Amino acid sequence: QPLPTAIGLYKNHPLYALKRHLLKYEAIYP
């Protein structure tokens, strides 16, 4: 499973995340 083929699958994904899918209190660190 290299990557899901759909962007919408990354929303609330247990293992993957996207910058556009970050919530108000969520951010990528580091």
Backbone as a ProteinNet text record, in pm:
[ID]
protein_1_A
[PRIMARY]
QPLPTAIGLYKNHPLYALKRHLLKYEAIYP
[TERTIARY]
82.6	0	86.5	141.2	227	153.4	38.2	-44.8	-186.5	-288.3	-424.2	-433.9	-520.5	-534.2	-626.6	-698.7	-795	-752.7	-763	-726.9	-820.6	-950.1	-1048	-1025.7	-956.1	-926.9	-828	-746.5	-651.1	-716.9	-843	-912	-938.4	-886.3	-897.4	-839.6	-739.5	-677.2	-592.1	-602.3	-526.6	-375.8	-324.7	-181	-126.8	-211.3	-166.6	-239.2	-173.8	-231.9	-181.4	-258	-225.5	-232.7	-160.1	-160.5	-299.1	-368.9	-503.5	-603.6	-572.9	-662	-633.8	-536.4	-506.7	-618.4	-653.6	-758.3	-703.1	-788.8	-748	-635.5	-647	-548.7	-440	-448	-353.6	-253.2	-127.3	-19.8	89.1	172.3	279.6	402.7	449.4	567.6	648.3	779	852.2	828.5
-120.1	0	125.7	161.5	280.6	408.3	432.8	549.4	526.6	575.7	571.9	657.1	614.6	680.8	801.9	822.9	931.5	1026.1	1156.6	1256.5	1248.5	1228.5	1224.4	1113	1006.3	897.7	938.8	1041.4	1088.8	1166.4	1206.1	1280.9	1190.1	1229.4	1150.9	1010.6	997.1	867.2	830.6	707.6	672	677.9	664.5	659.1	771.2	837.8	939	1070.2	1180.6	1312.8	1404.5	1510.6	1610.5	1749.2	1843.5	1980.8	2043.2	2018.8	2072.5	2008	1889.7	1819.3	1850.2	1936.3	1972	2057.6	2029.6	2103.3	2234	2306.2	2433.3	2414.1	2313	2287.1	2189.6	2135.7	2035.4	2096.5	2055.4	2103.8	1998	2008.2	1911.7	1956.7	1871.6	1899.3	1770.4	1773.4	1890.6	1917.1
0	0	0	-116.9	-125.2	-86.8	-149.3	-120.9	-172	-101.3	-156.4	-281.9	-373.5	-502.5	-498.2	-388.4	-377	-265.5	-291.8	-191.5	-71.7	-97.1	10.2	110.5	70.7	163.4	271.6	246.8	346.2	459.5	444.2	548.6	668.1	784.5	907.5	890.4	804.4	782.8	903.8	954.8	1076.1	1058.9	936.3	913.8	826.3	747.9	653.3	679.5	643.7	659.7	549.2	524.4	423.7	485.7	424.9	474.7	463.7	352.6	336.3	431.3	483.8	575	721.3	750	887.9	946.3	1071.6	1140.3	1197.1	1269.7	1328.8	1429.8	1515.5	1619.8	1576.5	1455.4	1408.4	1311.2	1325.9	1240.8	1233.9	1130.7	1109	1186.7	1278.3	1358.5	1370.3	1339.9	1290.6	1142
[MASK]
++++++++++++++++++++++++++++++

